[PDB]
Amino acid sequence: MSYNYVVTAQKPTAVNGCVTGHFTSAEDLNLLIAKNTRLEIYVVTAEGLRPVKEVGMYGKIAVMELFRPKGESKDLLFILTAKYNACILEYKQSGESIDIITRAHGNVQDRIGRPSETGIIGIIDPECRMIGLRLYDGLFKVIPLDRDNKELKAFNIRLEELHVIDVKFLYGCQAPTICFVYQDPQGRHVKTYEVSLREKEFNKGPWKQENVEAEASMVIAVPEPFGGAIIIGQESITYHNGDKYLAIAPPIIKQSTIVCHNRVDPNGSRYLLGDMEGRLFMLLLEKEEVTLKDLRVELLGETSIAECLTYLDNGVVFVGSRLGDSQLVKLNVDSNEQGSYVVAMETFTNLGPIVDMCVVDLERQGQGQLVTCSGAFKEGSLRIIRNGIGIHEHASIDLPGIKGLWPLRSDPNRETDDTLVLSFVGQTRVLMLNGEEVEETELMGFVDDQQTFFCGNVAHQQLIQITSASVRLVSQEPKALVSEWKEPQAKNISVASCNSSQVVVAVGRALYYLQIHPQELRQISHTEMEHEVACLDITPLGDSNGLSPLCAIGLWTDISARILKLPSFELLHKEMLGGEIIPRSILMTTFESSHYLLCALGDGALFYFGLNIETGLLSDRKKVTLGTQPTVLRTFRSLSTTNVFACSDRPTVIYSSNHKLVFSNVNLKEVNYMCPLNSDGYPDSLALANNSTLTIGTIDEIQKLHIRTVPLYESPRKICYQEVSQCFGVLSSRIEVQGTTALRPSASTQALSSSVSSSKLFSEEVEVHNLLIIDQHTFEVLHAHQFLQNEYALSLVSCKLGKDPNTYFIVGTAMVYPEEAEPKQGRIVVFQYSDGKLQTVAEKEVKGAVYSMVEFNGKLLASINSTVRLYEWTTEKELRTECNHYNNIMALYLKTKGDFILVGDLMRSVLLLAYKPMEGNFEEIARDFNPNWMSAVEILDDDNFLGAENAFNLFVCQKDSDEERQHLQEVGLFHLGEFVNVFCHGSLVMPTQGSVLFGTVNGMIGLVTSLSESWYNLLLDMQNRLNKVIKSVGKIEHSFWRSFHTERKTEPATGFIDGDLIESFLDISRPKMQEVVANATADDLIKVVEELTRIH
Amino acid sequence: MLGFLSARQTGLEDPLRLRRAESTRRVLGLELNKDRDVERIHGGGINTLDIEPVEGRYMLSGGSDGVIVLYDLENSSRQSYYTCKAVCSIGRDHPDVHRYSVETVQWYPHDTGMFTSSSFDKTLKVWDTNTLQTADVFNFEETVYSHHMSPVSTKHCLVAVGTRGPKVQLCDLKSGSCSHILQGHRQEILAVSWSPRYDYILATASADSRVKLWDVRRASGCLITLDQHNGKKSQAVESANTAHNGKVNGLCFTSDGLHLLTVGTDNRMRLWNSSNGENTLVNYGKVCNNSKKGLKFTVSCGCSSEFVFVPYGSTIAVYTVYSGEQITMLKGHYKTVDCCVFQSNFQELYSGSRDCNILAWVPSL
Amino acid sequence: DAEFDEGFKVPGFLFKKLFKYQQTGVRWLWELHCQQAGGILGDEMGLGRTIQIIAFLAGLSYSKIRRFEGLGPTVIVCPTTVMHQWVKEFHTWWPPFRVAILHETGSYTHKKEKLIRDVAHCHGILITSYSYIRLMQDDISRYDWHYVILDEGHKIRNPNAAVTLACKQFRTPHRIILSGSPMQNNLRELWSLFDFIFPGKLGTLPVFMEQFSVPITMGGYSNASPVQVKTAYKCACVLRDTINPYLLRR
DNA sequence: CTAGTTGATCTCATATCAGGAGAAGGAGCAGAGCG
């Protein structure tokens, strides 16, 4: 038996369904958003959305609709799960406590039935007399509501039409009357039936069947004033009320199909219509005195590709997208001078369809960092995910363009710095920051007329302020300046540096040493360098006498973070760096062990060193790239030790854990400057400035995933990391219409350089495919190689083959022509990225689609249509076949560990292949003979094979222990509820064995890891206890939810622990824990579950 | 297709689409696999085949020579070419072998450990698969043309048996009670079939050209008698309400159990609404059968479109159930085809025929 | 009230008057009604067997179960002695029903066929005797009866008596026999009773004799070989299993 | 009019050697076409 622990690293982000109504209260306007298993309840405030409750369903929310039965105060919620768990939910808030009580529930899955093509429809009678569910072909399930059930007893009415596209309940009808579009051989027609709950059968509808457009796919029930329905097809919008037949063919809706709609008004005079391109239309019903006069369609603008859209109020429209980020837009009354009325207010991150992903230890830390091909046609993008630190934004004040922050103890007695200084362009503005209050009040001795490069508290009970003109040492208690020094030529200081005792300030190409004496400023040392100063640091660290011994310098035109002996300004060391960019900050600090130096260039590169106190010679040069903006480094002292902060586009805390330098991310957008502050009202806090305002807060141990977004504007398909070249190779796909024309500027069309495939092998709208080389620091498209006409790039591996040392981008393609169902032609192209160009090093015409390539022990293992063959890289640099394997329907997925090859098939599901090198051929070791349609596969151990079937299930196969030894044994079964597109070894963090991430279509990132037998037994026990204690929203059983489910099989879960349910063991009060832990003590299990949460 | 893989991967289409559309595409590509064979063990024609409903690994096969062969359909060898080896066999030397032609053979639904087989020796024998010994024998006064166990009954374990007698016998495998009879037919019952949807609905077809659906719980005769015309030729029911203009020697509920396909010796197939037995007027053209005994035909399962595979003389004619369009005629047998059975996991068809062969039809590529 | 599976609600006061076994009976009778099968109430006499029918029919009418809107016209055939007893029983344990007596005594004092029509139209409960059933198979079997209870139904134990055939001309599936002893001399009597309630369960009479009566009988004789004893034992068990659902013998 | 009585009149239930002649069918078998 296998022992696996599944947990959610990132909850699903794709909005599969959204409704609005009065759910939390009769006066609240709620936005209920269904992300695959999460129901998110918001309150529609005058601005944005205020989250109120987020619950986890034990089901994929297939249907989600609000209805108000007679007498009810506020809307009840009907949810149907993909496994057909129906429930009616009511929201009951008792002060602080919030509950979602199940007013009714059931399971409406018919034992048998052909699940309808178009998918689970759930409608509710506008008068709440029944819930109509179309789940299967030829049947229409009715759940009465007037018969107030608690079990949702439902009955089928046999529907004489077997291919129903869409169906709605009509308005203003004495009987529940459905209107549906169905497809028969004679075309598509719209028909109506009246539902008799007493006779439990249909009756003749109000207006007979009508022959409608060929591609009619949408029915819109129109409220009572008009009644009738509006059927949207590809080329027409037609309105039916029984005798009235309005019909329009707005040319603007011909370009794309309309897939979602929403009624803006209560009276249906306006509808939103979202298309698969992301356009947003407004469908207007002009009334005449009431009947309907005419239909109009107007293009409001563009949004994200909407799966569902809901109109909230005051022009605010929530565009819920499965393919891109969900949106909160505004509809302006007037156009934007670009023809668009849509204006995005807010964007909700959606790791869209994660079609591929890789774990790269970027920034050369010990931390993994996901890079995912997220999104689709217009919403495609690369998302970079990492675990990141967060703080609270307590004290904000919006002063544009800060260029300075320093902590000052204006109260001389206290060692707390109760005053904050800021320089902006040419002056200094101070802040009292008294208490939590913040206002600008002036402390004597500092000038409001000059920029300030530095100020702070210094020894002898003195303050110091270094300006663009000259230095000012104020005596704190008595009065203003009694010591001033200025440059003899009165040249503005170009670079400064200072500590509590001494001062070091650069004047162009020469440097000046001053030291503080009480009510005096004494100059001692001077030097004339080759070129201008770039940055300094003189900080005394482990001082123990009163003065730092050493200094560091960066110079122009001789780029080098050099070292100086302080009393003499002499060269202790001179270490070059390279590049034409001046270093902009340099610092030395201690991390638990000794003095380090941290010098960075303007593009986020950063070198850490081991600095000696005697020689101060720079060695142990190693580099890390952090951000793209020039950087600055200021320390804050924590409880424990010095914790250096880096301020740029990606603010990063810098620190050492267990004598190992860590480069943590901070989850804030941008920080210009930082300074520690420990006020009476603020302990150990930070003071973080951006271009707009001064943000203030502390440091939080808890880590929140940080998601970067790189808009590609075209569907990414694959991604691999070539470390030697510092780039990502991404297979992208863009849709061109006409020869052809790009509908929008994609990332491929906007690369630095470009190329097109000129191959001698092969001689509406089309898909063009490119290979994008993307910089792994700036995530800019270094290069975009377009592939042949009608060539689909499917697979992409980065590797080095044979014995040559070059690392190659290897793309396996197929030639796609509409005249055929499976490509007959394709090729394996070998690229090399070097000198900013992508040369074609080799080619190989294969006779099928290359669905997958894995580098396999120095050799290329490709899977052409049904054959798995192994290629070798010859000294001539061409691919030469070594062995083939044919016993496959479609080798879609390939994995590797040693000599073993795991093949995920289109529908034979897994095959354990071995390359016996002694012979030079494959051997079918084991096979799983169950018909599972794979979506992805992975190798967990030498003998455990994770799989994902397209029915949202995970199974683990195991080579058993005669010819029954060629049978893989499915020892693990688990219903994930998500469609896995990719597995990958790795972890997002610095008890469990191994760690496999997976990315899904909904945007979930999960984590599978191996447990030991003892811990698995314990956790299974607690799983049962929590099931006995924790109560699910729709009263769904966890075991039923996690039971392996297929249309021709259903088994209980086994060998898999829902890490979500276990980790829920922390969010329950102590008495409930004791209920869990009846038969070791609780604190033991709290420790266990904490340690379990440590993995993600 | 690569559009289908990309659509599945990006969530544009439900994965159900790729499964069903690809399942259909596979059915349309059915071709005689000479890369697969079934071991020849019948000395006489194969009358019946049955792939087990759970795991679809094993097939039973009943011959005109009275032997029952038990095949393994999984390719346990590493080659791409394999012969479905015969695991067991109720051979000429088995003490319990049928004396005459085995006419029907059926896996017990819900479990592979027991199967049942009925013959022209007027017996329905229940077999323990493991020991391959009869656990029970029901004797009938008249030769058995077909029997059928409910694919759905978790509750009852009745076997409906059609003999040359005009009566339908229900044999309860739970304590053995072969007394219950359904009365109302007038000639031999050539085909019986339980509903896959309703636990106690049985459809029985007879040489008197009439098909009746029964609620065997009910004590009041047939629910429905299928009528070709639905009432255009309406008579006080004593001889009218014929499903066909010959003998009705075949029944098959569609997968979801909402429709009934009947084939009769008027060389027609009809599609009936199994709820009110109304004729859907699906054409299907001309379907040659002149079988004097039951004609075993199947439907597809889990495709975008349902198909029915009917023996058409020496070929298997494939039709679309709900439109009647003949997909193709699979031509690989040498004599008339008696039975075809559908493997729902991989869209494979096995057909036995009087030429002592069982041909596998697997999708091409 | 007391509630069973689909829509059967019997009034609570009526239910409380019943015993536990009588309540089980009412449930059993309704389950049969759901199957559309008949049964034998073979409770030993004195166990208030009649009260169970009253309760069940009352509950069925009260629940207004859906041709018929609840309880249609129904006929009770009982021995001549007990007709007014049944009338009395309906009248006390459920006044609402109209319980017409079909007899020379009777209460109608016109032609009887008018009374048959009246009950079949107004949906009463026509009590009658086995004789008037034998003598008006024509008139009575023209009115779509909903229930055909035979009290002391063993009188139908002769499959060839005229009264038996007349009783087996009724068409509805809801046939009930209330018979303290549904088998008195041999199983031929049993088959006859089952062929009224459930016309196919035990097969044809010849086949039933061949398969059940002969073996079961031969196992009772003193001189029967043990083999035949065991065949009898087998057949007897099969028979019990076959008749278990449809006979409620406490 | 209404019980009560009284015939019929039906139904249902109870049990173990010295004949002879001729005609019709069937079986064995020779042989002739003949495919």
Tab-separated table of C-alpha atoms in Angstrom, chain A residues 110-119 137-139 158 160 162 276 322-323 353 355 375 377 715 717-718 792 794 814 816 821-823 849 851 886-887 889-890 892-893 906-908 923-925 929 931 933-935 950 952 963-964 966-967 979 981 1001 1047-1048, chain B residues 1-3 5-6 8-12 14-23 25-26 36 55 57-58 72 74-81 152 196-199 254-259 273-276 301-304 306 322-323 344-348 365:
chain	number	residue	atom	x	y	z
A	110	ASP	CA	-28.900	8.761	-11.503
A	111	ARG	CA	-27.334	5.325	-11.332
A	112	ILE	CA	-27.186	5.337	-15.133
A	113	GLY	CA	-27.489	8.062	-17.736
A	114	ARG	CA	-25.523	9.666	-20.533
A	115	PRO	CA	-24.242	12.929	-18.996
A	116	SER	CA	-25.442	15.627	-21.336
A	117	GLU	CA	-22.928	16.989	-23.811
A	118	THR	CA	-23.308	20.684	-22.999
A	119	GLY	CA	-22.900	19.893	-19.291
A	137	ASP	CA	-29.478	13.106	-22.094
A	138	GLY	CA	-33.209	12.614	-22.476
A	139	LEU	CA	-34.086	13.314	-18.834
A	158	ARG	CA	-38.693	12.127	-19.802
A	160	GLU	CA	-38.503	13.743	-25.860
A	162	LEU	CA	-32.151	14.139	-26.342
A	276	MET	CA	-14.679	34.036	-26.058
A	322	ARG	CA	-11.431	30.879	-15.929
A	323	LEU	CA	-8.744	31.660	-18.501
A	353	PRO	CA	-5.143	26.798	-16.886
A	355	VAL	CA	-0.661	23.849	-18.775
A	375	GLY	CA	-3.741	31.347	-18.893
A	377	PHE	CA	-5.367	32.992	-25.759
A	715	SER	CA	-1.250	31.027	-25.038
A	717	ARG	CA	2.043	25.775	-23.843
A	718	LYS	CA	5.318	24.494	-22.365
A	792	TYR	CA	2.178	22.933	-33.836
A	794	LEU	CA	3.745	20.404	-28.600
A	814	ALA	CA	3.523	18.223	-35.644
A	816	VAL	CA	-1.593	20.171	-38.406
A	821	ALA	CA	-7.684	13.969	-37.363
A	822	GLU	CA	-4.194	12.865	-36.274
A	823	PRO	CA	-1.026	14.501	-37.667
A	849	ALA	CA	3.031	14.293	-33.577
A	851	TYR	CA	3.575	14.722	-27.928
A	886	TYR	CA	4.694	0.427	-30.231
A	887	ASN	CA	2.227	-1.090	-27.728
A	889	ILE	CA	-2.711	3.868	-28.191
A	890	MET	CA	-1.150	7.311	-27.737
A	892	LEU	CA	1.009	11.259	-24.344
A	893	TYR	CA	3.158	11.574	-21.211
A	906	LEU	CA	-4.469	8.549	-23.859
A	907	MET	CA	-6.625	5.754	-22.430
A	908	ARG	CA	-4.489	2.712	-21.429
A	923	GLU	CA	11.060	-3.963	-22.204
A	924	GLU	CA	7.470	-3.624	-21.047
A	925	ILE	CA	7.950	-4.247	-17.332
A	929	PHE	CA	-4.842	-2.510	-17.466
A	931	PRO	CA	-8.931	2.252	-18.768
A	933	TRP	CA	-7.598	8.542	-19.504
A	934	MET	CA	-4.479	10.291	-18.264
A	935	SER	CA	-3.955	13.994	-17.928
A	950	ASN	CA	-9.204	13.093	-16.799
A	952	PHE	CA	-10.290	14.546	-11.676
A	963	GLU	CA	2.885	-13.069	-16.133
A	964	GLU	CA	0.664	-11.411	-13.511
A	966	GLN	CA	3.320	-7.500	-15.629
A	967	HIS	CA	0.281	-5.939	-13.911
A	979	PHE	CA	-7.746	18.417	-13.608
A	981	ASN	CA	-2.033	19.154	-16.224
A	1001	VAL	CA	-6.817	23.699	-14.979
A	1047	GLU	CA	-18.424	7.018	-15.257
A	1048	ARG	CA	-17.747	3.245	-15.196
B	1	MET	CA	-7.251	16.283	-32.509
B	2	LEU	CA	-4.338	18.313	-31.107
B	3	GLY	CA	-7.077	20.877	-30.750
B	5	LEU	CA	-5.684	17.859	-26.359
B	6	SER	CA	-5.135	21.611	-26.149
B	8	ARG	CA	-8.679	19.579	-22.540
B	9	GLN	CA	-5.460	21.020	-21.199
B	10	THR	CA	-6.725	24.599	-21.092
B	11	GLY	CA	-10.160	23.801	-19.732
B	12	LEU	CA	-11.957	25.211	-22.752
B	14	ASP	CA	-14.780	19.541	-20.274
B	15	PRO	CA	-12.569	16.419	-20.398
B	16	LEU	CA	-15.833	14.562	-20.966
B	17	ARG	CA	-15.687	16.024	-24.467
B	18	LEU	CA	-12.359	14.492	-25.328
B	19	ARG	CA	-13.349	11.138	-23.843
B	20	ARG	CA	-16.663	10.891	-25.674
B	21	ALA	CA	-15.571	12.445	-28.941
B	22	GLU	CA	-12.505	10.238	-29.029
B	23	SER	CA	-14.573	7.195	-28.058
B	25	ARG	CA	-13.899	8.450	-33.352
B	26	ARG	CA	-12.571	5.106	-32.203
B	36	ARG	CA	-5.438	-9.553	-32.507
B	55	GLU	CA	-13.317	-4.834	-15.348
B	57	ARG	CA	-11.315	-8.545	-18.804
B	58	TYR	CA	-12.947	-11.920	-19.462
B	72	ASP	CA	-8.946	-13.595	-21.231
B	74	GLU	CA	-5.976	-8.681	-21.668
B	75	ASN	CA	-2.704	-8.672	-23.577
B	76	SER	CA	-0.521	-10.112	-20.875
B	77	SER	CA	2.335	-10.732	-23.302
B	78	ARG	CA	4.702	-7.905	-24.101
B	79	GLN	CA	4.176	-8.178	-27.853
B	80	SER	CA	1.840	-5.921	-29.774
B	81	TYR	CA	0.307	-9.087	-31.261
B	152	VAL	CA	-28.918	-3.398	-12.199
B	196	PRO	CA	-30.635	-1.360	-17.455
B	197	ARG	CA	-32.538	1.494	-15.786
B	198	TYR	CA	-35.434	-0.057	-13.873
B	199	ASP	CA	-34.855	-2.868	-11.482
B	254	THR	CA	-29.905	1.483	-25.254
B	255	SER	CA	-27.212	2.233	-22.698
B	256	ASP	CA	-29.152	4.702	-20.577
B	257	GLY	CA	-32.190	2.430	-20.766
B	258	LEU	CA	-34.516	5.041	-22.236
B	259	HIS	CA	-35.051	3.317	-25.572
B	273	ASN	CA	-39.504	4.587	-26.209
B	274	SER	CA	-39.104	2.197	-23.293
B	275	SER	CA	-41.418	4.282	-21.093
B	276	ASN	CA	-44.565	4.225	-23.255
B	301	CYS	CA	-21.538	2.942	-24.319
B	302	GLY	CA	-19.745	6.118	-23.360
B	303	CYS	CA	-19.423	7.718	-26.792
B	304	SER	CA	-20.555	11.101	-28.043
B	306	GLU	CA	-24.676	5.919	-29.362
B	322	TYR	CA	-30.993	8.050	-32.793
B	323	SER	CA	-30.653	8.998	-36.456
B	344	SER	CA	-16.931	-0.458	-23.364
B	345	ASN	CA	-13.445	0.283	-22.052
B	346	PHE	CA	-11.633	0.425	-25.385
B	347	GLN	CA	-14.423	0.532	-27.995
B	348	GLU	CA	-13.623	-2.990	-29.114
B	365	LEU	CA	-4.616	3.829	-35.052
